[PDB]
Assembly symmetry: D2
Homo-oligomer: 291 residues x 4
Amino acid sequence: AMKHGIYYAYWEQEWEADYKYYIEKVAKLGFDILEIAASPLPFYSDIQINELKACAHGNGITLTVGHGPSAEQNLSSPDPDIRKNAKAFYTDLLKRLYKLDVHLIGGALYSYWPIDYTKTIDKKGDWERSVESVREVAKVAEACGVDFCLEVLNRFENYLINTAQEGVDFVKQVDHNNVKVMLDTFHMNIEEDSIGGAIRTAGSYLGHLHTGECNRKVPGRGRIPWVEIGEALADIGYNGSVVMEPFVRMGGTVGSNIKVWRDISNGADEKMLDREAQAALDFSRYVLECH
Amino acid sequence: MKHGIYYAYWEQEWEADYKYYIEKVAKLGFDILEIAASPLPFYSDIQINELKACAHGNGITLTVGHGPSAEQNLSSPDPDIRKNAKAFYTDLLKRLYKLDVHLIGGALYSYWPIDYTKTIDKKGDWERSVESVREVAKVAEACGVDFCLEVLNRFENYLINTAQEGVDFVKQVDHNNVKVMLDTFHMNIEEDSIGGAIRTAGSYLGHLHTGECNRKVPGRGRIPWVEIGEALADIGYNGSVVMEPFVRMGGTVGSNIKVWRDISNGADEKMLDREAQAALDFSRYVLEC
Amino acid sequence: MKHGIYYAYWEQEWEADYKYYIEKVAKLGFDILEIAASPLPFYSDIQINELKACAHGNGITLTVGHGPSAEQNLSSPDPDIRKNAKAFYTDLLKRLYKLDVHLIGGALYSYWPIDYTKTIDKKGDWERSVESVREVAKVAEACGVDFCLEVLNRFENYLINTAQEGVDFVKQVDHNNVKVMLDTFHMNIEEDSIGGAIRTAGSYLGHLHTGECNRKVPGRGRIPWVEIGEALADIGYNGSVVMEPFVRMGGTVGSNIKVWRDISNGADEKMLDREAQAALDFSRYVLE
Amino acid sequence: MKHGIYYAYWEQEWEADYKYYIEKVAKLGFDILEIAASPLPFYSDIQINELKACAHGNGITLTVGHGPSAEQNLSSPDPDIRKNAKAFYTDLLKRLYKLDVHLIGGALYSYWPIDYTKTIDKKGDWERSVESVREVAKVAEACGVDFCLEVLNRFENYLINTAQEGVDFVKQVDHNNVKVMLDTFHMNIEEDSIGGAIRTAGSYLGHLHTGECNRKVPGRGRIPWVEIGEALADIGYNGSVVMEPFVRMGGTVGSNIKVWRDISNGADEKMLDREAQAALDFSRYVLE
Ligand SMILES: O=C(CO)[C@@H](O)[C@@H](O)[C@H](O)CO
Ligand SMILES: O=C(CO)[C@@H](O)[C@@H](O)[C@H](O)CO
Ligand SMILES: O=C(CO)[C@@H](O)[C@@H](O)[C@H](O)CO
Ligand SMILES: O=C(CO)[C@@H](O)[C@@H](O)[C@H](O)CO
Ligand SMILES: [Mn+2]
Ligand SMILES: [Mn+2]
Ligand SMILES: [Mn+2]
Ligand SMILES: [Mn+2]
């Protein structure tokens, strides 16, 4: 019923990589999707884009995209020039997604990430500016055939949208068909009173789901209430994609942004990493589907 | 075991009239009032004694919590900061002794909240902290105080994130007045198993903070209280249990804890009093035996 | 939401001085005392009034539970037994009206405990029950009583084991005074989902029994109380919630409930009172 | 850690063509096939060597389960029944030695299913059973067989309902080849804590049965599999894990297990295989 994927970053420490290599890999592991980071895409020549797309197609894999925007790409910024640069970044990015045959982008698209908490916070303001900026970027995504998914994050990674109710509120205000709410088991695990409740609250608006255990290991052997999640996705008729985003390695920008300060992977080599991702894929298909 | 509640549940700054809160929590039924250490250094020996008297008078025991500033960072590579940090704790510990306060907990091995803007040297900071803490432990052992190292989630600290890392750090310190401190809010993020984490701390568990996943008072959230209660019994925990709910926006507290929505849902002091009391009955009931 | 407790939590027989428990329960803070129906047929109109006055006085609502005997089996193939069964409930409902009791619950569509040696004809008994209950239901309407059919685990009943079955049975009866009743001890065994079972019962839910997996008072076991509070809220449940803990060996109750070890761990009456009161505070707090 | 499944998952009677299930199970990927012991006493020496050969040929290990009949009740007050009982198990154990199986489990210290009409004499039945099992243990040791006592829920047994009661019994038996056996379906009913029950069994746990709350295959139900995996690692479990799902109505199995609704949802043999295999993968992954 649902399509299952994994973020390429599970194997890499930077926000870019040889996506073709991961497409070939997740396809043999049996995944339906490979989620990739948007950051290197604006530096892809036309033929590079075509090759990536031809790779996904040839391997029967669908590409989705995640993005943690930089401060210069902050659609909610009070500075009108940053907003302008941001809109131009997204417009160019969305057109590149069109050339890639990609139809979903997700992450803290209504803000930037990681948040510099060193600075003063104007939530009400940022919220207002964000809703307006997202409104117009949404027109471009729609024209590009891309769903713009706004991911609800925990309090330490953002201050605008921390619960599914805030995400639904923000999205209703945006009021554009191709703009959705996106939940993540790791972020819900912290902020939500109820996991099934948060999903039922998102309901018809839910456009993407990220998965990971409480401490971001692969889905299945931790404390996340997977069965409850499966019932709730069934209650809301969720048709979509489910992308596991495990982060178990220290090091690099990835290690530092996700804040992995111990070797959660326990010395796993690449092959070990593959086997767990595959077991977690099988587990996700078995537990999360068909009610 | 004894149950308490951190005073900040009612305030938006890391200070307040602790005497007012002692009488409040005593009315509510608590055995403990946990107070922020921050204003304690600016106390006169007169203020210390009355607070101590106010507590004893109401039958309330006092515990202290502390989010060290950058300049109180015992892990700092800067020797002047380490110096000033030990000086701060030595005085504080002495003052705590003049209040018959026998327990202090928090990111005592580091600083909070930490600035992730700068570069982090985990292995270095860890070695410096072990040493500094063992030293402060001496002053602690003298003032009759258990120096409790709270295990925090990755967003708030990078040295100790799991009970296992906590036990290892404390064992490296190798001193009787240094303990591991667990918090249900942080365990909920970092641990594979809640009961397993508590069993791991075992004899080193010197203090426990409670709160729901999103920091509401214990009870109607997703925290596995029964499992916790059972594990505390597995390790024969005798220590205290202090709820540390944070449900209000605003101020340094709302900012440090990162409450960006009104979780209390417009609760007034009376409403907050009731929920705390309900959470108290709930905790004594579920967590014991 | 009104909270009660079943008097047998203290007693080892399906009968006791309900006046004594009405008072004990009133000081513990419950809103309801649930009693067994079996002694009621032996009460004079005077005793009935003495009971209804002791309750109205202590500000306690009374609910009734009943585990039918074989002779009271509304689903029996034996047309005589069905006739006797219908008269029994007809008389009982009339008595309940006098006591101003508006709810009766239990395996009212069958009997309890079930004798499993007797061969089982589920399809047969199911059709007979539906017919029999629809009749009794008119009587129930007249007396102003909600006839609640408790869904039980497979070891205590074979007709209705899950909320879905209960709902099908009730819909087939098709009569407003017939409700589905759930019990956490029973759901714990048979259901795929607790919150889901509740949501399935939805509008048909007329009564809820509570207890831990092993029948201890609500709160320190594995039943998912928060999930229940949430689902009751989702279906807009305002009915009552009655705990029915059984922690003592011995007697017809100990034998019928199958308590084969001292689950109360030597609790004396004041100890049992204390735990029921704590469980009551827990239930008001968590479930609402 | 070795995983198996009970052949009765596909059948409605306490016997069947075990060679057929050995091949099916090898193909699905299981390490073990657990079979009912009842047909085994009537196996010629030839049939025994054929079954053993099939098992070795397919890389499958065999374990055995058994619901004793009243005449095989080692706890019986009637000394003749105890005599028959002992002789039944001594012959059975030697056959297991021939078939090359090192494990037998079930309510071996009693009989199953239990006739509850008979008044219960727990204490008496308990002492006798301890004594009888101890004698049998010697034969079990001689045959290199682990005699595992399954802890059951109150509706199916009155002697051992919790892990603590099972350990007490086994410690009282005081013999190395007698072990405690837990079952997720039974634990779900009686225990305060699943993980706690497993850690209480600890070194004494010699076998584990799995099933969801309502006996569906492991995985999409409410059993806390992760907590079980963690407790098994806590104690360092070196035994096997056999799922024992019962999702079909009919026959002695359907009535003994009390399946009164089609839990399988019309699953044909093929769908049952797929689900069994999917649960095997889940079990290997989660229980670690
Ligand atoms: O849930 C998270 C943020 O922690 C994900 O969105 C990130 O892993 C992505 O890289 C941000 O798009
Ligand atoms: O649990 C926490 C961290 O979130 C405690 O450290 C703080 O709440 C104290 O106020 C300072 O340690
Ligand atoms: O759930 C149950 C016990 O199985 C209770 O409703 C019964 O014991 C009633 O007392 C009679 O049906
Ligand atoms: O758990 C159980 C009985 O409920 C199993 O051991 C039985 O089904 C076996 O067939 C006989 O012990
Ligand atoms: Mn995410
Ligand atoms: Mn804390
Ligand atoms: Mn009941
Ligand atoms: Mn079993």
